[PDB]
Design a protein around this ligand. Sequence first.
Ligand SMILES: CC(=O)c1cc(-c2cc(C(=O)NC3CC3)ccc2C)c2ncccn12
Length: 113
Amino acid sequence: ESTPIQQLLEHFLRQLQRKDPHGFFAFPVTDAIAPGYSMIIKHPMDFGTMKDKIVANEYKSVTEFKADFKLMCDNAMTYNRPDTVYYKLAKKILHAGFKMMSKERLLALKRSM
Ligand SMILES: CC(=O)c1cc(-c2cc(C(=O)NC3CC3)ccc2C)c2ncccn12
């Protein structure tokens, strides 16, 4: 049993995860691999958490999903230095997400529904 919003959100999530083939954004960051992480990042987010929220139907809208996506990227851009693979990849993901879930993109989608 799934719903149209769940299917749409699963599509966006799958498209974004394709940009992170190594799964750096797939699971929560621990302090053991990222020293100090929990002291600097107060609201952690990752793709796996987002997938669980989709499954539990916790997102009422694409706006709420976008907010978690944005948090995940902002966290990575705040914690990691600009030279790192994690920072760079966060910028890539974020740009892809802005393109995919922009207001004009969502308008065109609404037109077709
Ligand atoms: C998003 C973020 O800030 C982040 C993600 C990771 C991460 C890395 C690996 C890994 O396999 N790394 C080896 C290739 C070098 C696995 C799982 C995670 C969560 C990470 N590690 C250190 C500092 C920041 N991060």
